[PDB]
Design a protein around this nucleic acid. Sequence first.
DNA 1: TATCTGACACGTGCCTGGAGACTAGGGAGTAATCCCCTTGGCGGTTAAAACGCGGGGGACAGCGCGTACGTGCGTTTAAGCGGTGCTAGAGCTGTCTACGACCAATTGAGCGGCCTCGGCACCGGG
DNA 2: CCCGGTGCCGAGGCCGCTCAATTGGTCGTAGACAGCTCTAGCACCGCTTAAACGCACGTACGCGCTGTCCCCCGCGTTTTAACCGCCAAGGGGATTACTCCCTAGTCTCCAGGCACGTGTCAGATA
Lengths: 92, 93, 92, 92, 77, 72, 77, 82
Amino acid sequence: TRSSRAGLQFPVGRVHRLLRKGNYSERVGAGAPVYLAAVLEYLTAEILELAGNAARDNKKTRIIPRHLQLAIRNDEELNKLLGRVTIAQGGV
Amino acid sequence: AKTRSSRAGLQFPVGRVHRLLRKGNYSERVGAGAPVYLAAVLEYLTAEILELAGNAARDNKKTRIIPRHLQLAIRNDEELNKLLGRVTIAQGG
Amino acid sequence: RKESYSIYVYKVLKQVHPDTGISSKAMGIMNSFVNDIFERIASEASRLAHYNKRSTITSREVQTAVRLLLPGELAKHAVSEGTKAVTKYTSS
Amino acid sequence: RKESYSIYVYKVLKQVHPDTGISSKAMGIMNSFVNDIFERIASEASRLAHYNKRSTITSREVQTAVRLLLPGELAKHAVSEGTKAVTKYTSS
Amino acid sequence: KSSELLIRKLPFQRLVLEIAQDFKTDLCFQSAAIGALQEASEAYLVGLFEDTNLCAIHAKRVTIMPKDTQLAGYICR
Amino acid sequence: LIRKLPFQRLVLEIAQDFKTDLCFQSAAIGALQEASEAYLVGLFEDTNLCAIHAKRVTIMPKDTQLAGYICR
Amino acid sequence: NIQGITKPAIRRLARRGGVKRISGLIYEETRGVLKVFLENVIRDAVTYTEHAKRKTVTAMDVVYALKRQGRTLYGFG
Amino acid sequence: KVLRDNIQGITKPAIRRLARRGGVKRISGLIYEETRGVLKVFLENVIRDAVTYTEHAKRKTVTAMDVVYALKRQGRTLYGFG
DNA sequence: TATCTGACACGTGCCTGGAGACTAGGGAGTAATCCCCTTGGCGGTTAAAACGCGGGGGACAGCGCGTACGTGCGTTTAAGCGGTGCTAGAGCTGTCTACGACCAATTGAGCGGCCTCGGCACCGGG
DNA sequence: CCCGGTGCCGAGGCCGCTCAATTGGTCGTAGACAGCTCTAGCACCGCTTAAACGCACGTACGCGCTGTCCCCCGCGTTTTAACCGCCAAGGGGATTACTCCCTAGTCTCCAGGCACGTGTCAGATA
């Protein structure tokens, strides 16, 4: 696959298919799906790391929406990204 | 009529709008009547705002429509202002 | 050569007010406004066609984009003007 | 047959936290987050490509979109990760 | 500290359905549609009340009064 | 409402911290100036509203802080 | 109708907001603003539903409506 | 060359005039520093975005279109510089 | 009262982009089937809403003070304007080449159905 | 305010099918690069004068202080209707198959809109 070639856990074939079928440009390079998949994986890993840390600070062994919103709102960069976003079951 | 803008009886270009909807990465297929509809809508909006701006300029015994009259025509109208509530009219006072 | 909407805006002006002019700065403002409204309606129609798995932009996506983007009476009159123009186009 | 990022998010989670599970509602929220971020980056890069008359979305458009859409340290680490993935991919 | 829903499910469903009958008479709503609407409404009201409390504290008061809600709505727009 | 030369100098000062090498078209300076003027005028409108809500007539920095906090 | 949004519900929404003391004229304001917010969101959702020539409003219609108003909602699609 | 302290070039009467246009009648003496800081933050954000746009285009000149796009990305659409 | 002086406004050249005509190929329209999810109605319990009373806490008004703001006026600074002058630098253009789309064959990642056990709510004694 | 006994339903893993992604290859065209010319941003000068600054002074009003009272929160008791569970019915969403006409694509033709040049209406000048 191309994920293994790039060393990622997010699909590069699917991201390429989505950048192509999404009417974003007349043609898509071979390095755009890889870069975008890497960025998506990094952001997902950051959110999951912080949410699991919040769950550890709450003696729970499952990430639930409350932990996701604790991870998001307690980070200034990460909350500036998602300020206009509400979360189901997220609370305050 | 040869010109599509005249066949529909408009003043905005239907051919240019068709080309823009074709080269704008909105879809891989554009219908025949979509440019006509869009050009008619744009023409109606432009005519409305120009009418209000000219009426404002005639209320000040002026002949030409300057940015200030456009700002007055936009802000003094409810719906039009609601359409452009985050728009800064340069030199519009 | 660089295109614009100057000629058509002036023609619409000469219909609405036969004996008034328009300053060049106001002309640039009107051109920017036309570009902005075109982009708004086109983006909304593209998302409408993407959501319904459709490949083409018919007059029904453009009408719905107008219906969503414009306030009540403004949308009502824009829809009427578009319907009239489309009917006149197809009838010939 | 419905596309989703659940398996990749699970792989990332079991990488960062091998002992932490994740609720189904948290998977839905993370799946919405991934789709949202992918769409925002792709749209911003499409605008970057169009504004310069280019027809191709390269890695340079995605990098600029990331630099514009994410706050400072988040953007820095995302750019580093994306460059690393692209280099590892093209080095093979 | 909690993360539940604060309005009752059936009054909110009735209100949403009654509003919808003005816009188009013949519609069904999915159960997830009502859930999404209720979640968004609760979040919007909570944010409005936070801004209202900030306005009240600014006005040298402790209680919130309607004038706080118009100020918050006007600033946020 | 703001003198052109001080505003251009401030813009160049701010821009030197992002790329050392830049120059700015006069139209770019004009666009920045008009955007800044509009932004500050709107900020002062919301500050005055907050001040009147206080029962004051004099605007104070707390009024500006509330007008910036609520506006997000 | 709108009076199913009881006073205790508005108190619970206000106390999750942080409000300490509530005036008696607040509840009518809250009902009004809830009605307006729901009106806008439901109108957009009904437009989206009728464009697809459907007759049930789905959770995705409400999500697209909210995102059109700028109220992006996670957890429903 | 390098530039210093030009934010203090936004004199007391300029801020007062902006306030008068906004509708403010009486201005506390601590308002001026607050407004200078606010304007500095706003300009810093906008210039950062415009510089990014210019840098991607492989140029050395920030144009009016770059600033217009930077303002639009912030949600502050500007008319009159197409 | 002559004149002269810019931003609108109109007269030519043309070239390029829009139009007329025709194919070919598939996106979309529409009949038909299936069933999943909605609607509605009913019954119990019990949690939450509603009403009612008492007080004290906070809202609102008046007053008093002293502080800092507006106005004025003379001085001082530097913005604005004309003029020169240059050189980076954006844009146009001419090539050619490498990179992306398409298509054919193959296969393995991923998705749906299914199944067993662990993480979390409850509790009543610790 | 903790602890082991009971307990339960969705989370995590398994297995087979399938179609979307990978492999090798050619075609074509977008853009990377080198060259060149014309513009406009930037630096510096001399002069005018309009805005900015610095002090003085009255006074408008912001802050605190006290007093009055009203109405919101706590609490208790009564009512009601929300919610869980069941059941009966259907209708509209999702999919599948057959056809057609509408749009991309191509080619030729030509007109219309963009540039450049010059005339002209509010307004101050000799």
